[PDB]
Amino acid sequence: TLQKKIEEIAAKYKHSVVKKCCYDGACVNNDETCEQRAARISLGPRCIKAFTECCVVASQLRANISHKDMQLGR
Amino acid sequence: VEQLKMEANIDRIKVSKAAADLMAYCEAHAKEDPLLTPVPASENPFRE
Amino acid sequence: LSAEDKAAVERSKMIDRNLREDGEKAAREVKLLLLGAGESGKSTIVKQMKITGIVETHFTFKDLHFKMFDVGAQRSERKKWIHCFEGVTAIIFCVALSDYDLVLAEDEEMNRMHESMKLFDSICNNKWFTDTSIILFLNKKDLFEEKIKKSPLTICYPEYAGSNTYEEAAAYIQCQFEDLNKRKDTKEIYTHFTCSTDTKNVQFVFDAVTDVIIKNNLKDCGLF
Amino acid sequence: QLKNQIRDARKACADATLSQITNNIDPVGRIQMRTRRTLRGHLAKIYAMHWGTDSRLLVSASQDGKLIIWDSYTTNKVHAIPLRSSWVMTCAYAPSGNYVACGGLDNICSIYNLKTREGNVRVSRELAGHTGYLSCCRFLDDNQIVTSSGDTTCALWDIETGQQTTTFTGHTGDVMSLSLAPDTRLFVSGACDASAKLWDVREGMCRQTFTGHESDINAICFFPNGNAFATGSDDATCRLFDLRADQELMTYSHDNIICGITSVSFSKSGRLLLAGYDDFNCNVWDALKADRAGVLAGHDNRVSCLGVTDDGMAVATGSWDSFLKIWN
Amino acid sequence: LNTPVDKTSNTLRVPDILALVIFAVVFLVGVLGNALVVWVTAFEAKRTINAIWFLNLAVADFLSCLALPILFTSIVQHHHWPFGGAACSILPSLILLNMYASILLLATISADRFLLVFKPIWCQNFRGAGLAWIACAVAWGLALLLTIPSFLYRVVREEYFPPKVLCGVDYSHDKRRERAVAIVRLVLGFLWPLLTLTICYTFILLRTWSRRATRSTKTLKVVVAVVASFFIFWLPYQVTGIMMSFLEPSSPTFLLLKKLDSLCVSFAYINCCINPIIYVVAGQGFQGRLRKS
Ligand SMILES: CCCCCCCCCCCCCCCC(=O)O
Ligand SMILES: CCCCCCCCCCCCCCCC(=O)O
C-alpha cells in the first residue's frame, strides 16, 4: 500500500525533478518534521508542494505499522 | 674394625685400566645403544 | 588388531574410571599429621578424638571424614620422609607442659621442653609446611599446674619474670611457642590447653580444619 | 690409621684422571630427546618406577596408593593394584614379570603376583622386620628380593618362607637407594652417611666402601659392565665409582644448578648418564666426559624417578606432577 | 543532482563512531582473552572443578565477540539487513542467548563461591564436576528460555524508496506482550543476577573477614571489581531498553534513546572483555598454566 500509494502521487507530476523531490520527501526521517525539512528546499513551489504532500501521505502511512527497529544485539 | 681391615685387604687396580675398560665397553656397544645414535622411525616402536 | 586392542582399550578405560573414583574418594577425606616429643600425650589425643611404621587413624566428626597419621614410631631421619606430607590439611602438635622440669634421658643436660621447642621450630619453618597450619596442644594442664606450685618455672626459662601461677606460666609458654613462628602472615597457629577428660579438642580441630578448607577453597576460586 | 692407609692406596691407584685419557674420544653431539607417550593415570606425586625385562611394560608407584603397570607402546593400563599403605616410595618389577614389589613408610614390603588364576592381583606375601621405612627394593630372583630400609640396614628375603636370609649392617645413617649388579651376585647401596658400600649377596660382607660425596646419597645405579656405579647426592653432584679402582672416577656437577639429585640411570652402552634433578627437569650427562649432552624440561614438578629400558630403546621419567613421559 | 533535496545527507553520528571504536577494541581484546581462557580451562577442565564455570563463560564471551563484526557491518551499513528472513530470527537470538548465558554463568559462579564459603563441609563431601556441568546446562537452558521471544517475533520489513532491508521486532500492536517481555527480561537478566551477586559476595566478604586465617584483601578487590564492572556496564543498556519498550516512538525521548542505542550495546559488550582480564589477573598464575597446557 505504501509503495503503490506513493507511486500514484509520483506519477501525477511529470517533471523528473518533481518526482525526485517526491522521492525524497518519502524518505524516512524522524529527527526533523516535514515543515522543518520542506522549508530548506531550493527549488520552486511545485517541488515544495510535492514534497509536502508526499511527506504527509507517508507519515499517515508509517504511523499505522508497529514494526519497531531494533539494533542487532538487543 | 673387621669390616675396615676387610675392605683394606681386598686388592685394587689402577684408575687408567678401569677407565680404558669403560671406554672400550662404551665403544663396543655404541651401535647397539638406540639413545646414542638416532634410530629410524620404522625401527622405533614409538611412532607417534 | 581390533579384537585385542579395543578390548585392552576398554580395560584401560575401566581402570581410568576406577582410578578417578578412588582419587575423588581419597580427596573427600581430610589428612592430618600428628607430631610430638615421644610421650607428649599423643595417645591421649588419639583416644579422645575417636567415635612399626606409620599409623593411620580414621574418625568422623560433624560429617567430616578425618585421616590422622602418626609418624612417631618411625624413629628415623625426618628430612628424608617429611616431604611426603606436603599436602596435609593441618598439623596437630602435642607438647606436655610438664616437660619443663624433666631432662632428656639420652642427654641429661637439655630439658624436654627445649627439645619440643626445637622440633616445633623445625616443623614450622619447614619449606614443605610453609602454608600448612599447626594445631598446638598443651597437654598435662592439671599435672603442670600441680608441679608449678612446687617447682618454679625458671628452671628451664632463666629469662622468665613472672609469678608462679598457672595462668602466667601457661601464657608465657604459649607466647614462647608462638614466637618461634616466623611466617606469621601466611601461617596461623591454633593453641589450646587440654587434659585427659576434656572432649572439646575435637571441636577445636574441626574449627581449624574448617578454616583451612575455607582458605583453600578461596585460593582455588582466586579470591584469597 | 687404616683410614689413612686406604686413602694412600686409593691415591696411588689414581695414576691419571680418566678425563685426560678420554680426550681422544670426540664429544657426542647434543641430542634433543622428544616426548612420545604421556601417561596420565596417576593423580598424586609419583615416587618410583621400574622397567620390565621385555622393555614393554613398566610399573609406577604414586603416593595416592595405586600401582599401575603401563604398556609403554599403546599407553594402555595392564593392571591397577590398590595399595594397602598409601605412603609408598619404592617399587620393583620382577625379571620374569611374575611378581611386583612395593613398600614405603610402612616397614612392610608387599609382593604382588600378577599371573594369578583369579585374574586379580593379590599380595603373594608380606615381608616385615624392618624398623625404618623401606627406601628401595629390587628383585634378585623370582623367590629372592633384596631390600633397603632407613634403619641403617639392608636385608635379603626369601619370598617363599618370608624371613631374612641375610642382613647387611654397617651403615651409619639412613639407607636411601639400592642397585643390583648385572651378574646378580653383588649389589651397592647408598645411605645418608655420605657413603656407598658394596655388599655380597651370599657372603653378606661389605667388600668396599666409598666416601667421596658431601651429603646424603639419593640415588644409585650400576654401570652396565657391573664394575662401576653412579651415585646421586643432595649436594647436587653425581659421582662415578669403580669397584676395581675403588676410587672416584669423575664428578658430574655444574655451578648454575645447586639442588640435589633424585634419580640416576645409564644407557645400555653406558655412554649416556641420565640424572633426575630437583630443578623440575632432568639432565643427560656424558659418562666419559661429564658434559651436558641434553636437558629434559617436559616435567613441571620435581622429577622423582628415572629408568632406561633393558635395550635402551626409550627412557622413562616420572615426576610429582602425576605424569610419566617416555623419551627416545 | 543525486543528493537529497532536503539536504539531510545520512552520516554516522558521534555516538555511532564511539560505538564502532568500542566494538573494534572489545572485539580484539575479548577475542584474544577468551581464546586464551578457553584453551587454559579446557586443558584444566579435567583436573579442576573451577575450570568448568570459566570455560563456559569464555565460550559464551568468545561467541559474543565473534558475533561483533556482523554488528560492525550492520552499524556501518545503516542497519541494512542483507541476510534472509531466517538469519534475522536466528542470529540475534543466538547473540542474546550468549549474553544471557554469560550473565547467568557469572551468577552461578557467585552462587558456587557463596556455597563454598558458607557450606565447606557439604562441598567437601559432595562437590564435583557433575553438579557444575548441571548448573551450566541449567543456565544455558534458562538463557534459551529467555531468548525464545527473540526467535518468536523477529521479522524483516522492506524500505522501498531508500533501498534497504530493515530487521526488527513486530508485536502486532500488542503493547501488553511487549511490556511483559521487557519486564521479565529485565527481572531475569539484570535484577535477579545483580541481587544474587551482591548478596552472595557481601556474605562471602563478611564471613571471610570474620576470622583472621581466611581474611584477605584480594577477595575484597576482586568482589568490588566484578560487581562494579557488571553494574556500570549493564545499567545503561537495560535502562534504555526497558524505557524503549514502554514509551511510544513519537516522543523525542525515543529519538534520543535510538541515538544512544549503539553506544549502550557497545558499553554492555565491555563485560565480555572484562571477564577474561579479571579471570587472568585473579588466578594464581596464567603463564604457568599456559606453559603447562
Ligand atoms: C524478585 C527477587 C529476585 C532476587 C532473589 C534473590 C535471592 C537471594 C537469596 C540469598 C540467600 C542468602 C542466605 C544466607 C544464609 C542466611 O540466611 O544467613
Ligand atoms: C574499560 C573498562 C576498564 C576496567 C578494567 C578493570 C580491571 C580490573 C583489574 C583488577 C586487578 C586486581 C588486582 C589484584 C591484586 C592482588 O592479587 O591482590
> What does the DSSP assignment read for E130-194?
HHHHHHHHHHHHHHHHHHHHHHHHEEEEEETTTTEEEEEEE-TT-HHHHHHHHHHHHIIIIIHHH
- DSSP secondary structure string for all residues of D173-230: S-EEEEEE-TTSSEEEEEETTTEEEEEETTT--EEEEE---SS-EEEEEE-TTSSEEE
**In this structure, are residues D99 and D159 in contact, taking their beta carbons and an 8 Å threshold?**
yes
Q: Which residues pair with C69 in a beta bridge?
A: C33, C56
* DSSP label at residue C103: B
**Are D33 and B22 within 8 A, CB to CB?**
no
Q: Which of residues 140-169 of D touch C (CB under 8 A)?
A: 150-151
Total residues belonging to chain C: 224
Mutation test of the interface with chain C: which of E116, E122, E203, E280, choosing the one with the most C Cβ atoms within 10 A? E116
CATH value at residue E19: 1.20.1070.10
User: Cα–Cα distances in Å, from E87 out to A12, E164, E168?
Assistant: 39, 16, 12
CA dihedral E199, E200, E206, E212 (to 10 degrees): -170
Closest CA to D121 of D55, D77, D71, D62: D77
Handedness of CA E34, E37, E42, E45 (dihedral sign): negative
Amino acid residing at D228: A
Asked if residues D98 and D113 have their Cβ atoms less than 8 Å apart, the reply is yes
How many other CB atoms are there within 10 angstroms of residue E15's CB atom?
16
Residue with cell 587454559: E40
Nearest CA to ligand 2 atom 16: E218
Task: Please report where in the chains the cell 550468549 appears, as a residue.
Answer: E98
First to last CA, chain E: 63
Question: Does any domain span residue B16?
Answer: yes
- Residue C176, classed as helix, strand or coil, is helix
Residue among D56, D48, D64, D51 nearest D102 (CA): D48
State the Cα–Cα distance between residues D72 and D43, nearest whole angstrom.
Answer: 18
Residue D298 Cα to chain centre, angstroms: 21
Domain that holds residue B17: 1-43
Distance CA C136, CA A27 (A): 84
Please indicate whether residue E13, judged by its CB atom, sits closer than 6 Å to ligand 2.
no
D46-51 and D57-62 as β-strands: parallel, antiparallel, unpaired? Answer: antiparallel
Closest C-alpha to E161, from A8, A51, A27:
A27
Nearest Cα neighbor of C204 from C186, C192, C216 is: C192
Report d(CA D8, CA D10) in Å as an integer: 5
Residue E1 covered by a domain: no
Give the three cell numbers for residue E81. Answer: 539487513
D302, three cell numbers = 620435581
**D182, three cell numbers:** 648385572
Provide the phi-psi class of D157: left if phi over 0, else alpha when psi is between -120 and 50, else beta.
beta
CA angle D89, D90, D94 (to 5 degrees): 160
Where exactly are the structural domains of chain C?
28-213
Q: What residues contact residue D192 under an 8 Å CB cut-off, 6+ apart? A: C77, C80, D173, D174, D175, D176, D216, D217
* Touching chains E and A? (3+ Cβ pairs < 8 A): yes
Contact yes or no for D230/D239 (Cβ under 8 A): yes
Let me know if residue E23 belongs to a domain.
Answer: yes
CB contact at 8 A, E29 and E81:
no
Contact D65 C26 (CB under 8 A): yes
The set of cell numbers assigned to E1 is 543532482
**Letter for the amino acid at E194?**
L
CB-based burial of residue D8 (10 Å sphere; 0-12 exposed, 13-18 middle, 19+ buried)? exposed
What phi and psi values does residue D187 have, to the nearest 5 degrees? -150, 145
Strands laid side by side in the D35-39 sheet? D35-39, D324-327, D315-319, D303-308
Per DSSP (E only), the strands in chain E are: 154-159, 164-170
Q: What Cα–Cα distance (Å) separates residue E262 from each residue in A66, A71, E12, E229, E242?
A: 21, 7, 11, 19, 15
D140 three-state secondary structure: coil
Residues of E in contact with C213 (CB under 8 A): 120, 124
Residue D52 dihedral angles phi and psi, to the nearest 5° = -90, 160
Residues E231, E252: Cα–Cα separation, whole Å: 27
Report the distance separating Cα A48 and Cα D93, nearest Å.
102
Closest by CA position to C64, among listed C90, C45, C84: C90
Task: Give the Å distances, CA to CA, from E53 to D54, E31, E225.
Answer: 45, 18, 18
Query: Is the distance from CB of B48 to CB of D76 less than 8 angstroms?
Result: no
Closest to D206 measured CA to CA, from D171, D178, D172: D171
Cell of E92: 540475534
- H helix and E strand count, chain A: 4, 1
Q: In which order are the strands placed within the sheet that holds D228-233?
A: D217-222, D228-233, D238-242, D247-252
Q: Do D269 and B26 touch (CB under 8 A)?
A: yes
Contact status, residue B40 vs residue D240, Cβ threshold 8 Å: no
Preceding residues of all breaks in chain D (C to N beyond 2.5 angstroms)? none
What are residue D64's phi and psi, to 5 degrees? Answer: -70, -10
CA atoms within 13 A on the CB side of D59: 25
Atom 5 (ligand 1) nearest CA: E192
Provide the angle, in degrees to the nearest 10, between the axes of the packed helices E192-209 and E87-118: 20
Residues found in chain A: 74
CATH class of C28-213: alpha beta
Q: Is C102 exposed, middle or buried (0-12, 13-18, 19+ CB in 10 A)?
A: middle
**Quick one: which of C204, C219, C212 has its CA closest to C31?**
C212
Residues of C with a Cβ under 8 Å from any D Cβ are 5, 8-9, 11-12, 15-16, 18-20, 22-23, 26, 52-54, 71, 74-77, 79-81, 84, 86
Residue C152, class by beta-carbon neighbours within 10 Å (0-12 exposed, 13-18 middle, 19+ buried)? Answer: middle
Count of structural domains within chain B = 1
Is A22:A34 a contact under the CB 8 Å cutoff?
no
Residue with cell 639420652: C106
CA distance D241 to D181: 13
**E264 in Cβ contact with E236 (< 8 Å):** yes
- Taking the centre of ligand 2 as the mean of its atom positions, its distance from the CA of residue C223, in whole angstroms, is 13
Residue B19 to residue D288: CA distance in whole angstroms: 8
For chain E, the residue count is: 293
For residue B2, what are the CA distances in angstroms to A22, D205, E257?
A: 123, 10, 101
Tell me the residue length of chain D.
328
For residues C223 and C168, is the Cβ–Cβ distance under 8 A? no
CATH superfamily placement of domain D1-327: YVTN repeat-like/Quinoprotein amine dehydrogenase (2.130.10.10)
Which one of C5, C22, C76 has the shortest CB-CB distance to D151? C76
- For E219, nearest residue in chain C (alpha carbons): C223
Q: Write out the three cell numbers for D47.
A: 615416587
Name the residue among C30, C210, C222 with its Cβ closest to that of E283: C222
In terms of residues, how long is chain B? 48
d(CA C28, CA C32): 13
- Name residue, grid cell 554469560: E102
Tell me the one-letter amino acid at D236. Answer: A
Closest to C192 (Cα-Cα) out of C85, C73, C39, C48? C48
Beta bridge partners of E225: none
Residue D92: Cβ-neighbour burial (10 angstroms; 0-12, 13-18, 19+): buried
Return the ∠ at Cα D128 (arms to D126 and D129), rounded to 5°. 165
Query: Is-contact E155 E166, C-beta < 8 A?
Result: no
Interface probe for D, chosen from B35, B36, B47, B48 (most Cβ of D below 10 Å), is B35
* CA distances in angstroms from D223 to C76, D171, D270, E24, listed in the order given: 30, 22, 6, 64
DSSP state of A18: H
The whole-angstrom distance between residue E122's C-alpha and the CA centroid of its chain comes to 31
Strands C64-70 and C30-36: parallel
* Neighboring chain E residues of A67 at a CB cutoff of 8 Å: 155, 157, 166, 168-170
